[PDB]
Amino acid sequence: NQALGKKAISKMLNTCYRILGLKPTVIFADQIMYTGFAYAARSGASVGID
Amino acid sequence: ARVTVQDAVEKIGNRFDLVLVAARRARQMQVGGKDPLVPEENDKTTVIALREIEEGLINNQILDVRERQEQQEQEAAELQAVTAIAE
Structure with a gap:
């Protein structure tokens, strides 16, 4: 029930x-x-210069 | 099938005796010694040995008892055989 980091x-x-x-x-x-892995993909977390 | 030996170790509480015991039983079942006690499931001899250990069907004591029984039947047959070769 937390935000569950590393x-x-x-x-x-x-x-x-x-x-x-x-x-x-x-x-x-x-x-x-x-x-x-599955939800890291679903997220599509990327990194842009902005 | 086999992925962990945690319960096998639980039986033979060492994880160092477990290897020696399983190797004994597996060499038995591998060279023409014996036949599994748990139904083999297309498992190799070592995994079968572990599966037997887990069920409490094999340990050092069991193997020694079985061995002395084997030696005694060996004595019985061998004495009968020498006696037969006599006459």
Whole structure:
């Protein structure tokens, strides 16, 4: 429910590992990567001189 | 299928004994020693060994018990065989 920058993501992974365990966390990391790529693309975030 | 050994380690609580045990069982199943205890699923011998370990069907104790049983059947057959070759 936050704005979920880099640090927040890493601590979310760490909390998942401390609460659930190895396998759920590995599946979690894969899902995070997939969905982050997907919405980075959807965004079309670019960089212009303006 | 296999992606992690976390539960296998949970059984044999070392991750260093686990390798030695799984290698023992897998060399068994690979050279003409034995046949899997979990239904093989087109898995290679090492992954089958791990899948067996997970179910609590293989550990060091199990393997030693099985080995001594094998040696004793070996003794029985071999004594009978020498006796037969006598007469």
